[PDB]
PDB file of C-alpha atoms and ligand atoms in Angstrom:
ATOM      1  CA  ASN A  29     109.838 -99.953  55.112  1.00  0.00           C
ATOM      2  CA  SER A  30     109.722 -97.966  58.308  1.00  0.00           C
ATOM      3  CA  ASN A  31     112.335 -98.843  60.994  1.00  0.00           C
ATOM      4  CA  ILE A  32     109.926 -98.304  63.888  1.00  0.00           C
ATOM      5  CA  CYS A  33     106.679-100.048  64.853  1.00  0.00           C
ATOM      6  CA  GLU A  34     103.639 -98.206  63.574  1.00  0.00           C
ATOM      7  CA  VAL A  35     101.726 -98.666  66.839  1.00  0.00           C
ATOM      8  CA  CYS A  36     104.313 -98.043  69.611  1.00  0.00           C
ATOM      9  CA  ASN A  37     106.937 -96.052  67.619  1.00  0.00           C
ATOM     10  CA  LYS A  38     109.853 -98.194  68.958  1.00  0.00           C
ATOM     11  CA  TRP A  39     112.474-100.232  67.091  1.00  0.00           C
ATOM     12  CA  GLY A  40     112.982-103.919  67.835  1.00  0.00           C
ATOM     13  CA  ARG A  41     112.037-107.207  66.105  1.00  0.00           C
ATOM     14  CA  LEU A  42     109.804-105.814  63.351  1.00  0.00           C
ATOM     15  CA  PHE A  43     107.691-107.495  60.674  1.00  0.00           C
ATOM     16  CA  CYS A  44     107.370-105.489  57.495  1.00  0.00           C
ATOM     17  CA  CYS A  45     104.266-104.963  55.382  1.00  0.00           C
ATOM     18  CA  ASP A  46     104.683-106.131  51.751  1.00  0.00           C
ATOM     19  CA  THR A  47     102.084-103.722  50.389  1.00  0.00           C
ATOM     20  CA  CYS A  48     102.861-100.549  52.314  1.00  0.00           C
ATOM     21  CA  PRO A  49     105.934 -99.254  54.164  1.00  0.00           C
ATOM     22  CA  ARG A  50     104.600 -99.941  57.716  1.00  0.00           C
ATOM     23  CA  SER A  51     106.249-102.221  60.205  1.00  0.00           C
ATOM     24  CA  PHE A  52     105.084-103.927  63.396  1.00  0.00           C
ATOM     25  CA  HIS A  53     106.136-105.727  66.437  1.00  0.00           C
ATOM     26  CA  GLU A  54     104.531-109.134  66.507  1.00  0.00           C
ATOM     27  CA  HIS A  55     102.021-108.394  69.308  1.00  0.00           C
ATOM     28  CA  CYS A  56     101.513-104.713  68.452  1.00  0.00           C
ATOM     29  CA  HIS A  57      99.800-105.725  65.175  1.00  0.00           C
ATOM     30  CA  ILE A  58      96.224-106.933  65.640  1.00  0.00           C
ATOM     31  CA  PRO A  59      95.703-109.738  64.920  1.00  0.00           C
ATOM     32  CA  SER A  60      99.331-110.798  66.009  1.00  0.00           C
ATOM     33  CA  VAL A  61     101.582-110.961  62.944  1.00  0.00           C
ATOM     34  CA  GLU A  62     100.850-114.234  61.137  1.00  0.00           C
ATOM     35  CA  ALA A  63     103.546-117.055  61.231  1.00  0.00           C
ATOM     36  CA  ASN A  64     104.155-117.603  57.523  1.00  0.00           C
ATOM     37  CA  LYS A  65     102.365-115.842  54.556  1.00  0.00           C
ATOM     38  CA  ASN A  66     104.736-114.294  51.980  1.00  0.00           C
ATOM     39  CA  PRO A  67     103.594-111.809  50.912  1.00  0.00           C
ATOM     40  CA  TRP A  68     102.064-110.403  54.112  1.00  0.00           C
ATOM     41  CA  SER A  69      99.664-107.538  54.175  1.00  0.00           C
ATOM     42  CA  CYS A  70      99.082-105.491  57.371  1.00  0.00           C
ATOM     43  CA  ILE A  71      95.686-104.524  58.761  1.00  0.00           C
ATOM     44  CA  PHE A  72      95.893-101.052  57.234  1.00  0.00           C
ATOM     45  CA  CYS A  73      96.242-102.713  53.790  1.00  0.00           C
ATOM     46  CA  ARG A  74      93.480-105.218  54.480  1.00  0.00           C
ATOM     47  CA  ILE A  75      91.094-102.417  55.497  1.00  0.00           C
ATOM     48  CA  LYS A  76      91.977-100.378  52.411  1.00  0.00           C
ATOM     49  CA  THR A  77      91.231-103.442  50.246  1.00  0.00           C
ATOM     50  CA  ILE A  78      87.705-103.797  51.744  1.00  0.00           C
ATOM     51  CA  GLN A  79      86.973-100.157  50.881  1.00  0.00           C
ATOM     52  CA  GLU A  80      88.334-100.528  47.330  1.00  0.00           C
ATOM     53  CA  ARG A  81      86.326-103.680  46.683  1.00  0.00           C
ATOM     54  CA  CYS A  82      83.132-101.907  47.840  1.00  0.00           C
ATOM     55  CA  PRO A  83      83.387 -98.142  47.419  1.00  0.00           C
ATOM     56  CA  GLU A  84      79.764 -97.778  48.608  1.00  0.00           C
ATOM     57  CA  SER A  85      80.906 -99.052  52.041  1.00  0.00           C
ATOM     58  CA  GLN A  86      82.087 -95.468  52.614  1.00  0.00           C
ATOM     59  CA  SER A  87      78.636 -93.907  52.281  1.00  0.00           C
ATOM     60  CA  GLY A  88      77.248 -92.753  55.620  1.00  0.00           C
ATOM     61  CA  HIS A  89      75.675 -95.161  58.085  1.00  0.00           C
ATOM     62  CA  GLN A  90      73.523 -94.905  61.203  1.00  0.00           C
ATOM     63  CA  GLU A  91      75.398 -95.987  64.341  1.00  0.00           C
ATOM     64  CA  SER A  92      72.365 -98.032  65.462  1.00  0.00           C
ATOM     65  CA  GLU A  93      72.611-100.119  62.300  1.00  0.00           C
ATOM     66  CA  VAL A  94      76.420-100.563  62.593  1.00  0.00           C
ATOM     67  CA  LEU A  95      76.100-101.787  66.200  1.00  0.00           C
ATOM     68  CA  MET A  96      73.625-104.560  65.282  1.00  0.00           C
ATOM     69  CA  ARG A  97      75.905-106.052  62.632  1.00  0.00           C
ATOM     70  CA  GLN A  98      77.000-109.587  63.305  1.00  0.00           C
ATOM     71  CA  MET A  99      80.729-110.055  63.712  1.00  0.00           C
ATOM     72  CA  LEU A 100      81.378-111.650  60.285  1.00  0.00           C
ATOM     73  CA  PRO A 101      85.027-111.542  59.065  1.00  0.00           C
ATOM     74  CA  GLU A 102      84.854-107.974  57.716  1.00  0.00           C
ATOM     75  CA  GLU A 103      83.339-106.569  60.930  1.00  0.00           C
ATOM     76  CA  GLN A 104      85.816-108.576  63.038  1.00  0.00           C
ATOM     77  CA  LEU A 105      88.627-106.977  61.036  1.00  0.00           C
ATOM     78  CA  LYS A 106      87.188-103.467  61.366  1.00  0.00           C
ATOM     79  CA  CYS A 107      86.956-103.885  65.186  1.00  0.00           C
ATOM     80  CA  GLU A 108      90.570-105.192  65.258  1.00  0.00           C
ATOM     81  CA  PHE A 109      91.708-102.097  63.371  1.00  0.00           C
ATOM     82  CA  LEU A 110      89.716 -99.737  65.583  1.00  0.00           C
ATOM     83  CA  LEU A 111      91.333-101.382  68.644  1.00  0.00           C
ATOM     84  CA  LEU A 112      94.718-100.949  66.999  1.00  0.00           C
ATOM     85  CA  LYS A 113      94.089 -97.274  66.351  1.00  0.00           C
ATOM     86  CA  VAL A 114      93.502 -96.741  70.082  1.00  0.00           C
ATOM     87  CA  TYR A 115      96.753 -98.590  70.957  1.00  0.00           C
ATOM     88  CA  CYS A 116      98.527 -96.263  68.491  1.00  0.00           C
ATOM     89  CA  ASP A 117      97.991 -93.341  70.918  1.00  0.00           C
ATOM     90  CA  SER A 118     100.562 -93.362  73.737  1.00  0.00           C
ATOM     91  CA  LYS A 119      97.873 -92.492  76.294  1.00  0.00           C
ATOM     92  CA  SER A 120      96.437 -95.972  75.735  1.00  0.00           C
ATOM     93  CA  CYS A 121      99.063 -97.204  78.274  1.00  0.00           C
ATOM     94  CA  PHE A 122      96.720 -96.062  81.047  1.00  0.00           C
ATOM     95  CA  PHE A 123      93.921 -98.344  79.837  1.00  0.00           C
ATOM     96  CA  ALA A 124      95.886-101.366  78.539  1.00  0.00           C
ATOM     97  CA  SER A 125      96.313-103.569  81.584  1.00  0.00           C
ATOM     98  CA  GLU A 126      93.930-104.535  84.398  1.00  0.00           C
ATOM     99  CA  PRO A 127      93.219-101.561  86.680  1.00  0.00           C
ATOM    100  CA  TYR A 128      92.681-101.480  90.445  1.00  0.00           C
ATOM    101  CA  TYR A 129      90.753 -99.039  92.514  1.00  0.00           C
ATOM    102  CA  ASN A 130      91.709 -97.678  95.935  1.00  0.00           C
ATOM    103  CA  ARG A 131      91.090 -93.966  96.194  1.00  0.00           C
ATOM    104  CA  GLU A 132      89.600 -92.106  99.155  1.00  0.00           C
ATOM    105  CA  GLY A 133      86.076 -91.023  98.247  1.00  0.00           C
ATOM    106  CA  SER A 134      85.548 -93.351  95.296  1.00  0.00           C
ATOM    107  CA  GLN A 135      84.402 -96.881  94.759  1.00  0.00           C
ATOM    108  CA  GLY A 136      85.668 -99.000  91.845  1.00  0.00           C
ATOM    109  CA  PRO A 137      83.401 -99.860  88.925  1.00  0.00           C
ATOM    110  CA  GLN A 138      81.054-102.819  88.984  1.00  0.00           C
ATOM    111  CA  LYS A 139      82.490-104.092  85.694  1.00  0.00           C
ATOM    112  CA  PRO A 140      86.132-103.275  85.186  1.00  0.00           C
ATOM    113  CA  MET A 141      87.382-103.277  81.588  1.00  0.00           C
ATOM    114  CA  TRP A 142      90.711-102.718  79.837  1.00  0.00           C
ATOM    115  CA  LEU A 143      92.172-102.846  76.302  1.00  0.00           C
ATOM    116  CA  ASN A 144      94.101-106.115  76.726  1.00  0.00           C
ATOM    117  CA  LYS A 145      90.900-107.793  77.847  1.00  0.00           C
ATOM    118  CA  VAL A 146      89.101-106.492  74.749  1.00  0.00           C
ATOM    119  CA  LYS A 147      92.045-107.700  72.674  1.00  0.00           C
ATOM    120  CA  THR A 148      91.732-111.249  74.141  1.00  0.00           C
ATOM    121  CA  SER A 149      87.977-111.171  73.693  1.00  0.00           C
ATOM    122  CA  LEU A 150      88.370-110.319  70.025  1.00  0.00           C
ATOM    123  CA  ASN A 151      91.027-112.970  69.600  1.00  0.00           C
ATOM    124  CA  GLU A 152      88.802-115.611  71.184  1.00  0.00           C
ATOM    125  CA  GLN A 153      85.785-114.525  69.003  1.00  0.00           C
ATOM    126  CA  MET A 154      83.664-113.732  72.089  1.00  0.00           C
ATOM    127  CA  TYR A 155      81.783-110.866  70.491  1.00  0.00           C
ATOM    128  CA  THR A 156      78.798-111.782  68.258  1.00  0.00           C
ATOM    129  CA  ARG A 157      77.891-108.243  67.202  1.00  0.00           C
ATOM    130  CA  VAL A 158      79.764-104.985  66.809  1.00  0.00           C
ATOM    131  CA  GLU A 159      77.715-103.678  69.751  1.00  0.00           C
ATOM    132  CA  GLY A 160      79.575-106.068  72.147  1.00  0.00           C
ATOM    133  CA  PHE A 161      82.965-104.669  71.204  1.00  0.00           C
ATOM    134  CA  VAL A 162      81.778-101.025  71.216  1.00  0.00           C
ATOM    135  CA  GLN A 163      80.092-101.362  74.624  1.00  0.00           C
ATOM    136  CA  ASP A 164      83.275-102.748  76.243  1.00  0.00           C
ATOM    137  CA  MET A 165      85.454-100.002  74.639  1.00  0.00           C
ATOM    138  CA  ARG A 166      83.100 -97.224  75.848  1.00  0.00           C
ATOM    139  CA  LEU A 167      82.925 -98.819  79.305  1.00  0.00           C
ATOM    140  CA  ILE A 168      86.709 -98.437  79.715  1.00  0.00           C
ATOM    141  CA  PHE A 169      86.427 -94.668  79.505  1.00  0.00           C
ATOM    142  CA  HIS A 170      83.118 -94.384  81.336  1.00  0.00           C
ATOM    143  CA  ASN A 171      84.562 -96.335  84.299  1.00  0.00           C
ATOM    144  CA  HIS A 172      87.597 -94.022  84.351  1.00  0.00           C
ATOM    145  CA  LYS A 173      85.478 -90.837  84.313  1.00  0.00           C
ATOM    146  CA  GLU A 174      83.271 -92.069  87.093  1.00  0.00           C
ATOM    147  CA  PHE A 175      86.149 -93.186  89.339  1.00  0.00           C
ATOM    148  CA  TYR A 176      88.408 -90.157  89.015  1.00  0.00           C
ATOM    149  CA  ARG A 177      85.511 -87.686  89.545  1.00  0.00           C
ATOM    150  CA  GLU A 178      87.087 -84.213  89.697  1.00  0.00           C
ATOM    151  CA  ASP A 179      90.737 -85.206  89.597  1.00  0.00           C
ATOM    152  CA  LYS A 180      92.182 -83.760  86.480  1.00  0.00           C
ATOM    153  CA  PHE A 181      93.267 -87.315  85.598  1.00  0.00           C
ATOM    154  CA  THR A 182      89.716 -87.819  84.340  1.00  0.00           C
ATOM    155  CA  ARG A 183      90.856 -86.021  81.238  1.00  0.00           C
ATOM    156  CA  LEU A 184      92.909 -88.945  80.047  1.00  0.00           C
ATOM    157  CA  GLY A 185      89.673 -90.882  79.643  1.00  0.00           C
ATOM    158  CA  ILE A 186      88.114 -88.042  77.654  1.00  0.00           C
ATOM    159  CA  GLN A 187      91.207 -87.909  75.436  1.00  0.00           C
ATOM    160  CA  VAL A 188      91.458 -91.556  74.644  1.00  0.00           C
ATOM    161  CA  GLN A 189      87.671 -91.861  74.210  1.00  0.00           C
ATOM    162  CA  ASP A 190      87.865 -89.079  71.586  1.00  0.00           C
ATOM    163  CA  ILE A 191      90.470 -91.106  69.655  1.00  0.00           C
ATOM    164  CA  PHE A 192      88.186 -94.131  69.883  1.00  0.00           C
ATOM    165  CA  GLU A 193      85.098 -92.236  68.722  1.00  0.00           C
ATOM    166  CA  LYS A 194      86.769 -90.450  65.798  1.00  0.00           C
ATOM    167  CA  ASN A 195      88.247 -93.715  64.583  1.00  0.00           C
ATOM    168  CA  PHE A 196      84.884 -95.517  65.023  1.00  0.00           C
ATOM    169  CA  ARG A 197      83.125 -92.895  62.871  1.00  0.00           C
ATOM    170  CA  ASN A 198      85.878 -93.167  60.202  1.00  0.00           C
ATOM    171  CA  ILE A 199      86.223 -96.974  60.033  1.00  0.00           C
ATOM    172  CA  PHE A 200      82.554 -97.729  60.069  1.00  0.00           C
ATOM    173  CA  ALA A 201      81.681 -94.729  57.872  1.00  0.00           C
ATOM    174  CA  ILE A 202      79.166 -93.203  60.249  1.00  0.00           C
ATOM    175  CA  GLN A 203      77.060 -90.419  58.638  1.00  0.00           C
ATOM    176  CA  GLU A 204      78.565 -87.040  59.364  1.00  0.00           C
ATOM    177  CA  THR A 205      76.447 -84.701  61.557  1.00  0.00           C
ATOM    178  CA  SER A 206      76.548 -81.330  63.397  1.00  0.00           C
TER     179      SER A 206
HETATM  180 ZN1   ZN B  22     105.265-101.955  68.675  1.00  0.00          ZN
HETATM  181 ZN1   ZN B  23     100.411-102.449  54.886  1.00  0.00          ZN
HETATM  182 ZN1   ZN B  24      80.647-103.135  44.825  1.00  0.00          ZN
END
């Protein structure tokens, strides 16, 4: 197994996947690494299993259809993984914890949002459809773009949103387009 966490790329107290060579800190894995279970399979392995059990799940989908899916266990898992993939980028640090807004010439968003809040919401099963999760994720970056206006810092929101969107299209097998 790897000697660094897959998500944050640091050593420490790591839990090792039994079915692939990835390792995780306890709270870097999503969901948090489970207490017992030997063997243990990581979220990357669990996602691969879903695809292997239903190869047709990789045929292209319409986003509108994906968003209306109820958050049954497989969709819950896919959202957990998608959230994890965003945490895997180091620029996610900017969007992880609760922001505050005090900049001359801007007003903060009406509905602040951040990754750790989405993480809690997933953990507490607060989303009933995929749409709920996707709307909160997109709101994080939209709020950032709106607040930072022409500061070049706006680009961080564009960057992390692109990681979100690419991973969304991959995980939920959205039909490729030009
Ligand atoms: Zn970590
Ligand atoms: Zn694994
Ligand atoms: Zn099948």
